[PDB]
Amino acid sequence: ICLGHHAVSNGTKVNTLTERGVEVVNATETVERTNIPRICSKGKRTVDLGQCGLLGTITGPPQCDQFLEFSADLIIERREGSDVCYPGKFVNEEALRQILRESGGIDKEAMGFTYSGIRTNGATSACRRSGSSFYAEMKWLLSNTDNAAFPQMTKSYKNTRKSPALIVWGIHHSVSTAEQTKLYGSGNKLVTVGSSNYQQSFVPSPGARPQVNGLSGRIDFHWLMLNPNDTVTFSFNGAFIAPDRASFLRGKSMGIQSGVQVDANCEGDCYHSGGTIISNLPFQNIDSRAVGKCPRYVKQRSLLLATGMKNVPE
């Protein structure tokens, strides 16, 4: 009586510690290459920011009117998104994004700032609503008349909640020194900001910038996290974009950047801009910057795992 093992006509070459291209009876892939070109979001509270930039949700340009108090497990940023209406940018912008991506969304709260001896309804054609408007969560403070001076004001806000308060403000940089005085009067303008953890100061800087959205002026946005029971104080004399409301983080979420469509028919936990990596495999060769819960990125296209003996034909 003779015994032996099974074999096939066409086996699969795999690699071993000692051989390259040794044929086995059966093998299975270990590196994921199959991408689904959609954001698989089944069962997740998803917010597609679209034209609203993430930072815009805090300040409130017209594109973000529907996102002022969003709530999500999954936040999607889009290339077409803008944080701004009146040309400007955020100092420490990427830190703030990473904070907001995992915030679970934001909850707004009035800071109760009232004013006397100035204006507060400053607007622009860069922020279109009914007509010329401004950042919905901000207030553009000028001097009362077409010139005049700006009273050295002092505003404070105490965080009365058990969560850190995201505070944001703006420094306005006029096109000219003339424009700066036409708005807030002449002289050295100074904005000072401090908490029980923060310590900084700001000065405007009028000058000609290139035109963006039709305007050659810029607004400098700044932010800080105000701890519970801690107070922030704004000392200013012009060129100051005041916060109207503060922001609080709702909970927990994951934020991605993507160009593909949302799909509530598929579930996924590993995302990249080109879609969702749905896989049980330990490794992937699709995108090294995939985020969420993913197989490890490896540079190899393929790595076959033997699921059978060495294939030895007649």
Partner: protein, 166 residues
């Protein structure tokens, strides 16, 4: 051990299992399959897959921005780090599979040798090793006696007397 060694090739006809017996006697030729040897090898390969097909519960998020590039210095540290980790995992992956494949092959070779030497001991001097994985019988076993070998009931004494003479 055994495998592609003293068994020059495998049986493409054996489609009922991984390991099987092929006999020849008076009643003709036949071929079966050993379930307990096949299942033991299969359950072990299965054990590897369950352990390698694995899910991490560790979430990672963006520290990078592909719409608006982060500052160069921190950008370069990030890429430098990401690439370093890529090298490590590419290495781990290649070694893992190569290591696992070496063991899978040797394991399947082992289970064959374990089956063979068990049949050799299942009998006695009632048979001798041909050398190529075959057992020459000196008492002419029939299709019922062959089944006794397959389901492990062949008596290493109640054919001895006869076989000893030959």
């Amino acid at each position: 051990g055994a495998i592609a060694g003293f068994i020059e090739n495998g049986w493409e006809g054996l489609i009922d299992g991984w390991y099987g017996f092929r006999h020849q006697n008076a009643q003709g030729e036949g071929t079966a399959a050993d379930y307990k040897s096949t299942q033991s090898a299969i359950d072990q390969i299965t054990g590897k897959l369950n352990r390698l097909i694995e899910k991490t519960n560790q979430q990672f998020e963006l520290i990078d921005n592909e719409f608006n590039e982060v500052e160069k210095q921190i950008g370069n540290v990030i890429n430098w780090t990401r690439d370093s980790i890529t090298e490590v995992w590419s290495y781990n992956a290649e070694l893992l599979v190569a290591m696992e494949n070496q063991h899978t092959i040797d394991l399947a070779d082992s289970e064959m040798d374990k089956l063979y030497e068990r049949v050799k001991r299942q009998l006695r001097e009632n048979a001798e090793e041909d050398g190529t994985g075959c057992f020459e019988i000196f008492h002419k076993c029939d299709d019922d006696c062959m089944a006794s070998i397959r389901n492990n009931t062949y008596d290493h004494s109640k054919y001895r007397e006869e076989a000893m003479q030959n």
